[PDB]
């Protein structure tokens, strides 16, 4: 039909012909048109996931406010995402947990059960969430603030992400994208609570290629100079994300872990320990190689799983991804889009009218 007041109509019911809206198509900085058309069903799956992402994040921006708990924020967002993507096992769903990392924490925080953290007026919150259709994943992220003191820091990082998106292309060196992002990000100076800062890229955070059911397909997109001259290739899909900070510009692991994901390269492992075997079956059935969090195990009715989960991490079957934070007192911001390197053009598939 038409989408409802608070979104509830699945994207596939809005586009009944099964053809979803294109993102922003860009020229790069016969045969290829045929080759582009041959993968049309893949691009269409990314576009369905991207339209869900656009409609969920517009909804989130309408209601996210200080005073809400982080758990309330993530559950309200994920509810909407499950409805709009028309969650169906591993065929359509949430690609990874909702990040809502605060202040000096830049990535990989979502609340676990019992977290009483409440969003504050002065917080800078990075909302990073993913949708997929048939394993075609959209990773797209933006920063929420309520105090205008952070506006230039957000503009710096938004400009740096758009610079990396403009620089990207077939046969472009990943190191050149990094150098370009850093030049733009470091051109910004900000003043927050009477202290001035030159905005710094977080040098040990990166964008990444994306593969089917594989949020990180192994190529990294640097956000500072000095990286690898490995080239981007036709048909690849990339999350172009940049992170800016007022602190050291380096993150370390910190706080409790919430995010986990099966190692993509680990095959079947026979397990006899009963609780560990059951938890691995739950993971394989519900997530496969997609990332999950502890709240997502709780919602499936699992309990007494933390030792089984530690066991799967210690075996190397599952990897933990703890929150990544700069120094105490620092402020970090993030913007990200997913781009498709199609044969005929570069498509910023997750681009909206918002960012
Ligand atoms: C979650 C995240 O997308 C965060 C940004 C980036 O992290 C890093 O660059 N990390 C490091 O260098 C470790 Cl010190 C992404 O990796 C390039 C990272 C991502 C894709 O690897 C995780 C896997 C995804 C989930 C746990 C959601
Ligand atoms: Co992301
Ligand atoms: Co990403």
Swiss-Prot record:
Keyword terms, alphabetized: Acetylation, Aminopeptidase, Cytoplasm, Glycoprotein, Hydrolase, Metal-binding, Phosphoprotein, Protease
Binding site for substrate: 108, 216
Gene name of this polypeptide: METAP2
One of the record's GO cellular component terms: plasma membrane
Cofactor: Co(2+); Zn(2+); Mn(2+); Fe(2+)
Subunit structure: Interacts strongly with the eIF-2 gamma-subunit EIF2S3. Binds EIF2S1 at low magnesium concentrations.
Major place of residence: cytoplasm
Cell compartments where the protein resides: Cytoplasm
Keyword Metal-binding: yes
Protein name: Methionine aminopeptidase 2
UniProt cofactor note: Binds 2 divalent metal cations per subunit. Has a high-affinity and a low affinity metal-binding site. The true nature of the physiological cofactor is under debate. The enzyme is active with cobalt, zinc, manganese or divalent iron ions. Most likely, methionine aminopeptidases function as mononuclear Fe(2+)-metalloproteases under physiological conditions, and the catalytically relevant metal-binding site has been assigned to the histidine-containing high-affinity site. Also manganese has been proposed to be the physiological cofactor for human METAP2.
SS bond partners: none
Binding-site residues for a divalent metal cation 1, renumbered to this chain: 128, 139, 336
Enzyme class, broadest EC rank: hydrolase
Post-translational modification as stated in the protein's UniProt record: Contains approximately 12 O-linked N-acetylglucosamine (GlcNAc) residues. O-glycosylation is required for EIF2S1 binding.
Stated role: Cotranslationally removes the N-terminal methionine from nascent proteins. The N-terminal methionine is often cleaved when the second residue in the primary sequence is small and uncharged (Met-Ala-, Cys, Gly, Pro, Ser, Thr, or Val). The catalytic activity of human METAP2 toward Met-Val peptides is consistently two orders of magnitude higher than that of METAP1, suggesting that it is responsible for processing proteins containing N-terminal Met-Val and Met-Thr sequences in vivo. Protects eukaryotic initiation factor EIF2S1 from translation-inhibiting phosphorylation by inhibitory kinases such as EIF2AK2/PKR and EIF2AK1/HCR. Plays a critical role in the regulation of protein synthesis.
Reaction it catalyzes: Release of N-terminal amino acids, preferentially methionine, from peptides and arylamides
MF (Gene Ontology): aminopeptidase activity; initiator methionyl aminopeptidase activity; metal ion binding; metalloaminopeptidase activity; metalloexopeptidase activity; RNA binding
Membership in a protein family: Belongs to the peptidase M24A family. Methionine aminopeptidase eukaryotic type 2 subfamily.
Organism: Homo sapiens
UniProt EC number: 3.4.11.18
Covered residues, full protein: 110 to 478 of 478
Record: residues binding a divalent metal cation 2: 139, 208, 241, 336
Example GO BP: regulation of translational initiation
